[PDB]
Symmetry: C5
Subunit: 258 residues, 5 copies
């Protein structure tokens, strides 16, 4: 792909705007945005998480206006987590911080992640415990060995399906993703406070050091996200992951390629 000039004229720019909903596991008809309560295996080899207990990566493939060689080039992103204030509900059968106190808020381990590319996000598998038995309906690292706990280059995938790729098994592959820009933060620890900023005044530029943004193959834009905000603690002490949706607004321009 030899990248040539940007087209100008009213015809030459478009914008994509949407929200990606979280895929936390949704253990029943009332619990969209939550996982199943977390249970702990008695040994590493008996770790066998249920599908509804595992947060997964969210992905949307967004069709763009048909171009054909011109390709749509992603230039800027505005993004934010939607519903941050819902975490102020400390009255809905939570565990009291102390006698007569309010409910404990969502807190603990979080992962906030987003990416914009001209093709599916490329993944590398890394396992906390290579003996974990991942459940039917998920897509997970296969032929796992003990080396999979640090780096096994067999574990390559594309984030090409929703509700499928568990967050804990997969990360962006830094050896690939030439045509994607990704950003993520893991903040670990059972008592970590969510710190969630919102504003409509912040923009991320998606251009690389050569002035080129992701180029959308087949006129498809790929957006991916994870927003595990922490865990909700019920009155009983049981804990569930809670996630939130992520807003994306991407500005694209037409670029000629050879």
């Amino acid at each position: 792909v030899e990248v040539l000039e940007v087209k100008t004229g009213v015809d030459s720019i478009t914008e994509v705007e949407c929200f990606l909903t979280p895929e936390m596991g949704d253990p029943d008809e009332h619990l969209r945005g939550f996982s199943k309560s977390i249970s702990i295996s008695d040994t590493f080899e008996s770790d066998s998480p249920n599908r509804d207990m595992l947060p997964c990566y969210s992905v949307a493939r967004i069709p763009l206006p048909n171009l054909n060689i011109l390709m749509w080039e992603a230039v800027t992103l505005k993004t934010e987590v939607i519903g941050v204030t819902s975490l102020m509900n400390v009255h809905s059968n939570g565990q009291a911080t102390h006698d007569n106190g309010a409910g404990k808020p969502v807190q603990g381990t979080s992962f906030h992640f987003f990416s914009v590319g001209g093709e599916a996000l490329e993944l590398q598998g890394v396992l906390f415990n290579y003996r974990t038995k991942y459940p039917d309906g998920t897509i997970f690292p296969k032929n796992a060995t003990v080396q999979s706990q640090v780096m096994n280059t067999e574990h390559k995938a594309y984030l090409d399906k929703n509700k499928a790729y568990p967050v804990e098994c997969w990360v962006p592959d830094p050896t690939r993703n030439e045509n994607t820009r990704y950003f993520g933060t893991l903040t670990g620890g059972e008592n970590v406070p969510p710190v969630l900023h919102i504003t409509n005044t912040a923009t991320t530029v998606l251009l690389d050091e050569f002035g080129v943004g992701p180029l959308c193959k087949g006129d498809n834009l790929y957006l991916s996200a994870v927003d595990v905000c922490g865990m909700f603690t019920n009155r009983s002490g049981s804990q569930q992951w809670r996630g939130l949706s992520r807003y994306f607004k991407v500005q694209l321009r037409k670029r000629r390629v050879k």
Copy 2:
């Protein structure tokens, strides 16, 4: 069609004010506080009383009567009364035997916006089965999808003491004519960190050099400043809020 800025004597004005918090005000002595928080016995029976729910604050400020429109260019803002949180002697729960009272701390939301029309809101519910109380304006026809995103839940922040903080956020798909800024810091032991200074200015211009344009010569200011919770001797906890200062500089802009 946004054209040139007017210059000269007549061409600039300034709005200054304070927005008071709306934390619930459970009796005649408790302005700035919510009712003590109670916890539902089950998830599906969540039913908070009105005076236990902090709400968004809003003020519509009339501007000098003027096509010209007032354009909001700069903002200075801060929380007013930060030091009041040093009152650790007013029947609080002692940190330990013979200790001082626990200060206000825990989950906070600090938010402000400036716009030329009402802030546009999107509803998101922690629990879609929460029964919100009479006197509040809340997401209607809630479904389980309301827990992550239900696009039916659209509203305007057009009334005080009405829109609960926990149900609503700025709608990022709208608000083209508003600039908003907010931070949620969650967790029961989070410390308030509150900065004051008269030397900091936020510029409200967009990337094209245009600020919010004030329709009908009105400026919209919105805020939430839930600072955390106060813990009483008994262990019961109430939200505590503070007022927010706004100073906005505006200039006359021609529009076609």
Copy 3:
């Protein structure tokens, strides 16, 4: 006043250097820099703190060389003096755990300073409007429930030492055009003090038009609060601990009409 040109020449600059001591309550002859130990009221309505339990704003009015020309404050260097004293964890403190060192000063802090050409202007805000503030302090009068969020009756000048309780008053953002102020409240009973010292950091006091505070009557006003946190005694009782603040201000002569 029209602000005209800065005067130049050897004669045209001056410098003020001083320290402001903290006013934490000083409950006896050995406890300068500390408050009285904190007591908690039995009911919310009966809150009635003693004067020696209430830290106050510090202020100094500094006379400048006699001079229309006015002295214009241009820069500030400032820092908290005696930060290392907080390493004394061996003086009648409460042990962190069995056999452990004493708990250091920690918890709620307020660090504040201002430089102006007239007294700092204050606005009152009350945690609890039914608090009975003690004789010898200057506090918001005619308090109502609105005073818990905003009652514009409560206006004052920081014009006296050992008088204006920190917990009652903040800088009035609707005034103070001729002062620059800066403060941080860090609340919570376990927050760690984080105190930086250096002689290499300068704050510029000029506004967006390039004009600094202009000293009316050739007086410079400096104000400070440095409540570093609470010291916990062996018994568990807790006292506020404050420290002094250094100020160095550079000033220049400015013509006005």
Copy 4:
């Protein structure tokens, strides 16, 4: 070396891309990336850690295209920790946060370190306790004295072997390392949260204040890392170090020297 001009043209640049795996101790065939459970000596004089309980520095010597005077000059680095999301496995034989709660995540003391150089990283030994008996198979400060607890200039070494130099005994020698760029952060304390950021948009420039990067002696590039993320607590309360792999991508150019 007198440093002269940079060569230009198609042939004048090369890139190195790889991952360094962590060397945390690997106490059995299922625990790659973990140390042995930590045990505590009764006294300073009886401190005698086993080899599998001691994380070590990772190092790779990467041969570069043969040049001969020209040398490869390292100019930029992209790096990130691989597998950050694996730390969201809070269901695999971990100690519950509280009754009925999720497993505690990896947390506590961490050391994140990386270096890029034109020769081996130079190390200086500093011991917490000079009377520690370091185990067979490790390379550790020899002839330790009480002065070794603060600075004993005898303890000089090169990071020239994997699985050998314990992290707790050695630091980069600030008095040397003119031909290396190193960066590290120790965050100590039993409850500190991991905060791990990932993105493919961040580059570190390796040039010094004269515009000169590490110069690769004998056409070898040396990459070194430690990423001790914290400790994993199992259900019994025992704690093990957990580490992760680090990705490196280094761009190099040819430089003439005299």
Copy 5:
């Protein structure tokens, strides 16, 4: 003195490189870098710390090449705490974090300080408790009064001797020190985590707003430091300060003065 031009030519620059060891109290022949265990007086009045329980400021006076009017002007500083990874020894007579856990790492109150000057650092005394009895062998504020607890201007000194000036009763005097640059941070609290960064890529410029660095009177450079990293808790629960050495590299140039 009037500061005139900088000298140029290869003769005109010099460099000082050294390390300053910590002086934490060194309670016996095996505990270099540690204080004595910390004990607590029953009253303010009875506060009487042992010499070996009191960390002190470190100082080195470094002779420079003889000049004579020319003076050496200090222009840049690179500095680093040496041995940060030693704090990963959590297996040496430490108190377990919980049953079967690892040892508690060094944590709690820290003071990290350094200065570079052309004369001795000027100190001002401030006492936590003016009735504290400072021990024989230390140099402390004399004629203390209750005003010494906030500011007593009688308490002036020069940092002109090692193992002498206790950290807790002296600070840099901001009313003096025109010919020194100093930097320090106190982080207080019993559980605060050490956060220690190391790199050889960071330089501090020592020039003031007029482009003039410290001028070395009598061809002597003064380096001062404190690096109290926190406290080590042994198995009994007793606590000792732990310090580390600090590296300095200072670049100087010849300046003419009148």
